[PDB]
Amino acid sequence: MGQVSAVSTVLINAEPAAVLAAISDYQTVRPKILSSHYSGYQVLEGGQGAGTVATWKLQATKSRVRDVKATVDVAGHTVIEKDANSSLVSNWTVAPAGTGSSVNLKTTWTGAGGVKGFFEKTFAPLGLRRIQDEVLENLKKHVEG
């Protein structure tokens, strides 16, 4: 059994420890770095570190909206978001990168079929990867200035 996922790494002009905290902040950071594909963001528990629970809608296209209920698991410099509603997990791994830092964002894919059917029928992985990349950009700009 293999594994497929949307992976993108973005360089950030900021301390990786600060970025880690920013990621674990689901109150003042998370909802300020969301793309236009996000809506109805609501923190259900915590909002600052492990144990945080938050929910939102992710609209890939007109008639593709994912109801996400992410459980946050912060450990070291990796923040894991496990959707309780569907089989989607997003990994937020941040690490030093020269004078700044970088974040490796890995969002897993799912579905009854393979990537072909995942794209054609359900939520386009090409769009999802773009969405996550755009959020990483927002994060970079957010923590930078």
Explained architecture:
The protein is α+β, with helices and mostly antiparallel strands and 145 residues long. The chain has one domain. It is built from three helices and seven strands. Strands 1-7-6-5-4-3-2 form a seven-stranded antiparallel beta sheet, with helices on one face. The chain is globular and about 40 Å long.
**In total, how many beta strands?**
7
Strand order of the largest sheet: 1-7-6-5-4-3-2
Give the helix/strand class.
alpha+beta
Q: How far apart lie the N and C ends?
A: 43 Å
Number of helices: 3
Estimate nothing, just give the exact number of structural domains.
1
Please tell me how large the radius of gyration is: 15 Å
Reported for the largest beta sheet, the result is: 7 strands, antiparallel
Instruction: Write down the secondary-structure element order.
Output: EHEEEEEEHH
Shape, per Cα inertia axes? globular
The level of helicity is 10-25%
Range of strand content: 35-45%
PDB class: unknown function
Keywords: predicted polyketide cyclase/dehydratase, unknown function
Assembly: monomeric
Entry title: NMR solution structure of KanY protein (ms6282) using two 4D-spectra
What is the strand and helix layout of this fold?
Blueprint: E1 5-12, H1 16-24, E2 38-45, E3 53-61, E4 64-75, E5 78-83, E6 89-97, E7 100-108, H2 115-120, H3 125-144
Quick recap of the structure?
Pfam families: Polyketide_cyc2. The protein is of the alpha+beta class and 145 residues long.
Name some characteristics of this structure.
globular; 145 residues; unknown function; predicted polyketide cyclase/dehydratase; 7-stranded antiparallel β-sheet; monomer; alpha+beta; 24% helix; 3 helices
